[PDB]
Subunit: 442 residues, 3 copies
């Protein structure tokens, strides 16, 4: 039934296109001048509503899916599957970062152009920042792993601020911990996996609880169906709002065309050559057909710019349309979302290479390897914190000591490239799931 | 067994009467002068303890009751029942507001009297307020519906404050969102209903989870029995404390007797003529007998002045004493508490008409309809936020541009009329439940 | 199998000893000068990680264990068991406080010595404090009992701050309530017990839910096994960090040797004479053998200095190694942790007697009884709040009006005696559990 099957894909693609058209027409016809902030809020509000709906269920779906998936195969096979999955995610993120270096080095987006100016963008506010240390970031990562409280971890994460409690002499900023807002999805993932392993360690005592969590996840999936049918309206209004919130006639594109083209080309090459090649090599099944099977979550990622929001829609589409195993999907795809960020590592590395290319820095071999490794680790470093969309580039440049004086340049255009990043991240998650499904099948 | 059956009703009526007598005697014999703030806190503390007990269980009871009630009848009948229930609540709230107009217009409580003075009450602090816009209130309503996180929604709700982030020129206050304290019971209600519909959409997978939630609610009901047996002491001490906290020899009654009489008469006429007439018309069964069946929750509402607190006691009494169906009770009565506020719409409209009557405003037909509709919507507008006992009148007067210069007059006497409001709200909820029980039975 | 059975006990004792050796060697070899704050954080971080792990599971384990234990015996036997348990905890805490008086009165640690000076310790900051009233502390106790919301009670507790809302004349600080951080484990304990009683009041409706909670607790116990195998590393690094954070060559020991010896001797006499004597008297079974059965939780308490953290390890060890009944363990040991603080009452009383002994106060009989009773009540007074490690001594001295001018003396050495306090608290909990197991068996 092609007409009914492809209806959703048609609807969300039409939603994205019509949202772009609506926003461009509104901005050209007057935009904010004809709109006002109140009508801007009402115009963006369906987007905020879709993101409120899809952030409501990631906690049930992630927790109960991992508990229902971990306790479906014995811990030996689970350990092997988790290890090969982490290896796959690490390799894909690393290949993405290397592709970013190879593109930004060649196209040279940091050539002398309008982007050389940074007074308007920075205006002295770029240097002023928390300036989180790399060690403190890794410690906050390993403290959001193994949370102090599960309930608080359902909406809070640990962030190490810096006070000035060294008045005795030579004032040095010292770390203090204070829980902030944002889900600790990494901690919940680890707790859930460990729980499911515990229930598989038990036998008849755990059958009730596995039945509970599988039923709960199936109910949440039934909610996901209806959220999915709502999603095109939210995507349309969200995209229209996010191109009405800033003019996009071509001024910022004319400013940073090489950098944005480098990022989008890197994302497409990662998402249409590298990972499809890996899938074909391993499972020997049409990767582009599989990619067409998941267009609706990809479009939702492009609209939403959060891997959080698109994941329920994705797990529904992968388990339903494509012939991916239910337990493998449950175990892998949440872990893919919180760890694999191929696009994030990609455009972080490309941004670093761009800001280094302007001012003519060297970056011969050692600094290249450094940016690769710290981008690969920051794939998960940025994962626990939702606020740090591109904030993690500052700590990278602190590690390797580059000019952070114009990091605010990307914040004007962060809303664009992060979308394609989200697309590639969910794509890499699904391709890992398919590969590991075939590996477990063999 | 009349002696054992009516014991609780006798006990709570005696508690209210003895609390009034205790507070009046203490205030006459010296009150605070003989008491001190520390003994005032210890004297009110049983009231605070009862409200802490009854706010502990509304979350379990509401969530699990709606999940156990929604998934007891098919979604078609559920949709019809929900639609006729919302229509009933809307019509009752609208009739209440019209009754408020009809009374305040006739009795004319805003005649020239001591209430004309407002310097002592306002003293310039009335105008200073957040001044929340109507659109922003509706957006916060639809964002507390569809919460971002369920756990946070168990004790937090979304409130749009206003910052001054327009330093570029012509400083205009802009909205920012920041979650505040207070349960998001509307969001939990909607999520729970949707969940129960999902479990009914499933079949054998959901039987476990329905059995879980029904068992959990029955356990919470068993707690409610013991809280109910404690409740008269809390009501007595609470009422005594709330008339010791301000002198009530008759000064404020002598000031606002017409307004308070108008509100209480409106509440009684709504609760003893209109809704009993509707019940008799539809189900043809003794409405005043049914009203006598539920005296203990009504007295608890009068003491507590929160529809939150009285609801567990009410659902216990309605399912136990009166012959109302268990599933219909579960589905309707929580939704009644968070949506139907007949008394709130009533005294909000009466307060508006009173403040308009002083200063001799017109309010011919269009403004009357405006106050009716905005009161009907603010019945649920004030529902998500517990702090806004009468705060929502300011945004109404912002919509229709009346003198808010003396809104602080009612805050001295808000503690009185809100009690009768709570009584009428729970009464309207039960009468809707009985009507819809008979409709489903037919 | 002695070699495999005693492996854990060997490992944690070796961990404590090696942590002491590591910290002393690091402090002697340069300590902070060779370390830096960043490496100090990385060196303490395994300790923080163990405490994050053991605070993650106390909520599941406490809640589900009490629900699974309360609903295993009928409410009559439960009421008797709870009453005899509270009587036992009260008597043991009182005996501990009397032992503290008897030791501090005899050894006279407040003799004229270096400890007479307090300018360096206090420096005027001792008097400045919240100065919480005793009545307000008891009210906050009874409001953390019977929480307003269960979810918030999973990570928040009620603390009455004091504002200055008496500008009308004679500015007097007035209480305001605002929820703060810290688990409301007392409220969760009471709610859980009451819930389990409700499920036992029900019959077939509750069997599912009891099976759920028992399965959930068993899963959490399975997590506890792995946390237990990790624990020695955390204990070693934590102890090393907490003796590297301050020099302990003997300066503070040379300052307060009599006071610390009094506290440790009181703890050992309570833990090795009084309670073993009671156990032998009642159950007639080797108490020191039972004490050897639980060495690993005692060492964990000595390392961690929190009865929160050690309790999962303790309930595992008591149910597994020693022949204590599962239901009795579940019901008693959590209640022991949140109520019985023998060591806390002990060193609080000893600290009071020490600060009274310096400056030559009388403390004949009435003040002795006062300190005993307020210490016995503050055993649970300090229990709800984790921040108040020794903060509760100030409100005691407010009750009985002693010099609080040098309360900051103990804060330098609070990290030492609180460890032995935690050891004795968990020890008293287990001994109560064993006694009541034998009583129920008889
Ligand atoms: O902050 C993030 O990363 C940046 C945000 N936009 C870019 C993108 O989403 O690709 C990169 C982030 C967002 C979402 C989740 C997530 C949460 C719950 C379940 C599953 C996933 C993790 C990390
Ligand atoms: O703020 C409110 O409305 C005013 C407060 N006092 C008046 C009254 O209670 O009638 C009007 C409010 C209070 C309570 C709940 C509620 C919460 C949970 C379950 C069920 C109900 C909704 C809204
Ligand atoms: O603040 C406390 O008491 C002082 C802290 N250090 C000393 C000690 O732990 O002995 C005394 C405290 C700590 C922990 C818990 C606890 C929490 C959850 C489950 C079980 C228990 C109660 C109260």
């Amino acid at each position: 039934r092609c007409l009914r099957a492809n209806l959703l894909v048609l609807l969300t693609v039409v939603a994205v296109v019509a949202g772009v058209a609506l926003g461009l027409g509104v901005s050209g016809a007057g935009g904010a001048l004809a709109l006002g902030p109140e009508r801007l809020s009402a115009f963006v509000f369906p987007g905020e509503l879709l993101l409120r709906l899809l952030r409501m269920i990631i906690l049930p779906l992630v927790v109960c899916s991992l508990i229902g998936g971990a306790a479906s195969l014995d811990p030996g096979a689970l350990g092997r599957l988790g290890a090969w999955a982490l290896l796959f995610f690490l390799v894909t993120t690393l290949l993405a970062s290397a592709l970013g270096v190879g593109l930004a080095l060649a196209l040279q987006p940091g050539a002398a152009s309008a982007a050389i100016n940074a007074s308007v963008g920075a205006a002295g506010s770029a240097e002023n920042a928390p300036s989180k240390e790399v060690l403190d970031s890794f410690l906050d990562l390993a403290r959001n792993i193994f949370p102090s409280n599960l309930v608080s971890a359902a909406f809070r994460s640990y962030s190490t601020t810096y006070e000035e409690r060294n008045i005795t002499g030579t004032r040095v900023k010292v770390p203090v911990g204070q829980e902030v807002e944002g889900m600790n999805i990494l901690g919940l993932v680890v707790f859930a996996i460990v729980f499911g392993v515990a229930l598989r360690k038990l036998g008849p005592e755990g059958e009730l609880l596995i039945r509970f969590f599988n039923s709960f996840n199936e109910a949440t999936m039934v909610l996901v169906s209806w959220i999915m049918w709502y999603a095109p309206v939210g995507i349309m209004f969200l995209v229209a709002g996010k191109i009405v919130e800033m003019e996009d006639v071509g001024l910022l594109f004319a400013r940073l065309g090489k950098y944005i083209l480098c990022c989008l080309l890197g994302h497409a090459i990662h998402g249409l050559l590298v990972l499809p090649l890996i899938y074909f090599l391993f499972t020997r099944k049409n990767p582009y057909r599989f990619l067409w099977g998941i267009v609706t979550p990809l479009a939702t990622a492009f609209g939403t710019s959060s891997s959080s929001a698109t994941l329920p829609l994705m797990m529904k589409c992968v388990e339903e349309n494509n012939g991916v195993a239910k337990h493998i999907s449950r175990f892998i795809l949440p872990i893919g979302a919180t760890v694999n960020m191929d696009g994030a590592a990609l455009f972080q590395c490309v941004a670093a290479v761009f800001i280094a290319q302007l001012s003519q820095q060297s970056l011969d071999f050692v600094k290249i390897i450094t940016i690769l490794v710290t981008a690969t680790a920051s794939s998960v470093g940025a994962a626990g914190i939702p606020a740090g969309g591109v904030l993690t580039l500052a700590i990278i440049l602190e590690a390797v000591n580059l000019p952070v004086d114009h990091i605010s340049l990307i914040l004007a255009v962060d809303w664009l490239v992060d979308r394609s990043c989200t697309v590639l991240n969910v794509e890499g998650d699904a391709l890992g799931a398919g590969l590991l499904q075939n590996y477990v099948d063999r």
